């Protein structure tokens, strides 16, 4: 019957699904919460380098808000 196609499509749908979910989840992980900041222009990149420098632990995703300044 025509619905026997679905077991065929379902597994590859999972096979196609895994790359998307894995990339999003590892982005959340290796960047610790906030997604991987995107630097399409030198302005965003030097922003990121400022974040890495200001973190003091060489991790751009570490953010120091109002508790840092005096």
């Amino acid at each position: 019957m025509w619905f026997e196609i679905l077991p065929g499509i379902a597994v590859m749908a999972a096979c196609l699904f895994i790359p998307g979910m894995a990339t999003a989840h590892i982005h959340k992980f290796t960047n610790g919460g906030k997604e991987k900041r995107v630097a399409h222009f030198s302005y965003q990149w030097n922003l990121m380098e400022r974040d890495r420098c200001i973190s003091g632990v060489n991790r751009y995703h570490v953010t120091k808000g109002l508790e840092n300044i005096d």
């Binding site: 499509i9 749908a13 096979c15 196609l16």
Partner: protein, 293 residues
């Protein structure tokens, strides 16, 4: 862990390349009153394993008049390409957010012609020589329609950054603004697409072309917090397109070469130019030029 993410893409795509074949045969089967693979495992679930390990156990005969060096690097490029354009896809968040992703996709996908060109030359047979010649001219004819469609599409997008496509569509599917181009684009994708490899190379091209068409024309809403929404929508859209891609595989007599060139250069290229002219002035026409940044 970034390396793990690559294997978390290449292998499942490789399996995805492996596993839609049973979808093809059973869709193509059930279409013609047939059943498709259903005796090997439940509903042919194990049919892909039934063929792959058989193929790797089959000895790869090599023609006597074959240049081994080219005969083994042409599949190397063919697989290397077929698993490389999967990397910049804006699927939730792309592995590589290249600011020129569309250009990179085109340059590296247009490189696939070398594999078939080398295969025909390295094989060194009368059949292989013409077949390579026919395949390449059919292919090299069709980037000009590919490039113009994508170029003219991207005027209302904003840039070649593939991630920006999601922001552009958001409200409506982008087909509603360029549906004359969608049929223009979709048809051109059909024709552009050792022997054990060549299954994998063109086949990832088949799904990725539809994945590429999915993001381009039928976008989705990417919620910043929950990414699974875009994952399901992207997969569902690229499945419907691929089913259509095989829907037409067994629904038309195959094109003949003289019409194949005639169809493009006399009925596809001139109309593609007009639509590009329509979509280059219309953002200017309505003061709706998009932001690149």
């Amino acid at each position: 862990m970034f390396m793990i993410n690559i294997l978390s893409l290449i292998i499942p795509i490789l399996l995805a390349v492996a596993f839609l074949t049973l979808v093809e045969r059973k869709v193509l089967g059930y279409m013609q009153l047939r059943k498709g693979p259903n005796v090997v495992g439940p509903y042919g679930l194990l049919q892909p394993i039934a063929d792959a390990l058989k193929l790797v156990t089959k000895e790869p005969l090599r023609p006597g008049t074959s240049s081994i060096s080219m005969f083994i690097i042409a599949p190397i490029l063919g697989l290397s390409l077929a698993l490389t354009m999967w990397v910049p896809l804006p699927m939730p968040y792309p592995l590589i957010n290249m600011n020129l992703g569309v250009l990179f996709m085109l340059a590296m996908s247009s490189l696939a012609v070398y594999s078939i060109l080398w295969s025909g030359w390295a094989s060194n047979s009368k059949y292989a020589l013409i077949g390579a010649l026919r395949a390449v001219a059919q292919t090299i004819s069709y980037e000009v329609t590919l490039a113009i469609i994508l170029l003219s599409v991207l005027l209302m997008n904003g840039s070649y950054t593939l991630s920006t496509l999601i922001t552009t569509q958001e409200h409506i599917w982008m087909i509603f603004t360029s549906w004359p181009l969608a049929m223009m684009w979709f048809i051109s994708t059909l024709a552009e697409t050792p022997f054990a490899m060549f299954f994998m190379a063109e086949y990832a091209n088949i799904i990725m072309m539809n994945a590429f068409t999915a993001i381009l024309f039928l976008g989705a809403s990417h919620d910043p917090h929950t990414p699974e929404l875009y994952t399901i929508n992207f997969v569902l859209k690229t499945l419907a397109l691929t089913i259509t891609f095989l829907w037409i595989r067994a629904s038309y007599p195959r094109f003949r070469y003289d019409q194949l060139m005639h169809l493009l250069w006399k009925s596809f290229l001139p109309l593609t130019l007009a639509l590009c002219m329509w979509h280059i002035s219309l953002p200017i026409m309505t003061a709706s030029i998009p932001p690149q940044s």
